[PDB]
Design an enzyme around this catalytic site. Structure first.
Site, PDB file in Angstrom:
ATOM      1  CG  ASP A  35       7.884  -2.035   6.670  1.00  0.00           C
ATOM      2  OD1 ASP A  35       6.671  -1.870   6.468  1.00  0.00           O
ATOM      3  OD2 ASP A  35       8.773  -1.736   5.839  1.00  0.00           O
ATOM      4  CB  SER A 199     -11.151  -1.568   1.535  1.00  0.00           C
ATOM      5  OG  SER A 199     -12.168  -0.844   2.194  1.00  0.00           O
TER       6      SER A 199
END
Ligand SMILES: CCNC(=O)CSc1nnc(C(C)C)o1
Length: 330
Positions: A35, A199
Site C-alpha cells: 500500500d 498530473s
C-alpha cells in the site's frame, strides 16, 4: 541488494493485489497488500481477536526465534475506506522477493475491522508511503522501504500491476524490459507523507486533451481512480445511461456499454487507461448495472491515482533525497 516479488489480484475484478512476504525465523509467509498510501506493516496474528479471524494466515511471533516485542509500542490506523486495525508491535526479520530487512517493525493486530475479517485473502498490509505517516506510538517506526533503502542498489521500488493478471513489485532496480518507450519523471511532495504529484491533465476516449493540474496521490492500496467531480462527470457523460447513484455510492453504467479509455498526463507524456480497466462489474450478482472504476474524489479531500490508473503504467517510486515518481507505458 535488490528484491523482486510477484503480486497477484485477490479476485476477478483486481480489487486488490497480494504479495507474499516472509516474516520471522523460520519464515512465516503471509500475503500482504502493498500500500503506497500508508506506512504501517501490520499482520493478522496469534494475538488477533479470534472472532475477527476468518481464513487469514496469521503471524505467530512466539514461533519466530528472531521476533522481539517492541516494549510499550502500540499502533492504531484508520484508512480512507473506513476500515481500521490496531495492536502491539514486534521487530522481526522481513523478506520480500529475496530482499531482507532485519529489525523491521511488524505490527501485530489485536483488533481488525469487519472488512478485513471478511477478506480471507489479505493477511495484512505493507505500507510504502513515507515513514512520517506510520502510526506506532510512542516511537514512530520506519517502513520496509525506508529500512531497506540504504542497502538497495538504487533507492527505488517499482509497481507493475497487472490487469486481470499478476504483476511485479521490484526493489532496488528498474527493469528496463518491463515497459515501453521512456519513463517520465515528475515531482513528489512528501508534506502529507503520501506519494503526492500533479498530473498535467486528461482526455476522455479519443477526445482532446484538457491541460489542467490535478494534484493527487499514487496509491496502490486503493482500487479505483478518484478525481475531481468535473473530470469524472466529463468521463461518464460519454457512456450512454451512466449516472451517479447515491444509493449505490457512485457512478454506475449499463453493463451492456463499451467504456471509453481515459488518459492522464504525466508531464508531456500520456498514460492511457483502456476502457475495460474501468469496468468493475455488476453492483450485485446478476445485476445489469455495473460499477464504474473512475469515481469522484469530492468527498475524500484528495485525488487518488489508485490501481485503475497505476495498472496502466510501469510506476517508479524514487525515494532519493529529491522523491520523484516515474510513469511509463507498458
Ligand atoms: C526512502 C523512504 N523514506 C522515508 O519514508 C522517510 S520519511 C520521508 N518523508 N520525506 C522523505 C524524503 C524522501 C523526501 O522521507
Amino acid at each position: 541488494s535488490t528484491g523482486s516479488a510477484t503480486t497477484t489480484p485477490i479476485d476477478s475484478l483486481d480489487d486488490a493485489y497480494i504479495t507474499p512476504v516472509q516474516i520471522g525465523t523460520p519464515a512465516q509467509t503471509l500475503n500482504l497488500d502493498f500500500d503506497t498510501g500508508s506506512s504501517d506493516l501490520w499482520v493478522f496474528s496469534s494475538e488477533t481477536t479470534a472472532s475477527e479471524v476468518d481464513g487469514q494466515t496469521i503471524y505467530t511471533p512466539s514461533k519466530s526465534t528472531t521476533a522481539k516485542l517492541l516494549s510499550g509500542a502500540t499502533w492504531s490506523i484508520s484508512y480512507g475506506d473506513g476500515s481500521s486495525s490496531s495492536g502491539d508491535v514486534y521487530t522481526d526479520t522481513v523478506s520480500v522477493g529475496g530482499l531482507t530487512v532485519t529489525g523491521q517493525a511488524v505490527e501485530s493486530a489485536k483488533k481488525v475491522s469487519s472488512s478485513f475479517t471478511e477478506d480471507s485473502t489479505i493477511d495484512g498490509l505493507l505500507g510504502l508511503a513515507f515513514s512520517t505517516l506510520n502510526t506506532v506510538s510512542p516511537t514512530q517506526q520506519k517502513t520496509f522501504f525506508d529500512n531497506a533503502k540504504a542497502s538497495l542498489d538504487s533507492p527505488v521500488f517499482t509497481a507493475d500491476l497487472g490487469y486481470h493478471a499478476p504483476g511485479t513489485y521490484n526493489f532496488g532496480f528498474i527493469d528496463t524490459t518491463a515497459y515501453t518507450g521512456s519513463i517520465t519523471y515528475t515531482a513528489v511532495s512528501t508534506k502529507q507523507g503520501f506519494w503526492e504529484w500533479t498530473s498535467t491533465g486528461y482526455a476522455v476516449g479519443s477526445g482532446t486533451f484538457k491541460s489542467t493540474s490535478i494534484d493527487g496521490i499514487a496509491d496502490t492500496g486503493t482500487t479505483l481512480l478518484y478525481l475531481p467531480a468535473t473530470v469524472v462527470s466529463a468521463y461518464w457523460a460519454q457512456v450512454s445511461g451512466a449516472k451517479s447513484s447515491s444509493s449505490v455510492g457512485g457512478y454506475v453504467f449499463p453493463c451492456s456499454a463499451t467504456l471509453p479509455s481515459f488518459t492522464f498526463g504525466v508531464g508531456s507524456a500520456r498514460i492511457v487507461i483502456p476502457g475495460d480497466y474501468i469496468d468493475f462489474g455488476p453492483i450485485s450478482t446478476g445485476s445489469s448495472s455495473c460499477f464504474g472504476g473512475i469515481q469522484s474524489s469530492a468527498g475524500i479531500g484528495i485525488n487518488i491515482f489508485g490501481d485503475v490508473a497505476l495498472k496502466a503504467a510501469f510506476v517508479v517510486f524514487n525515494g532519493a533525497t529529491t522523491p520523484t515518481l516515474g510513469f511509463a507505458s507498458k
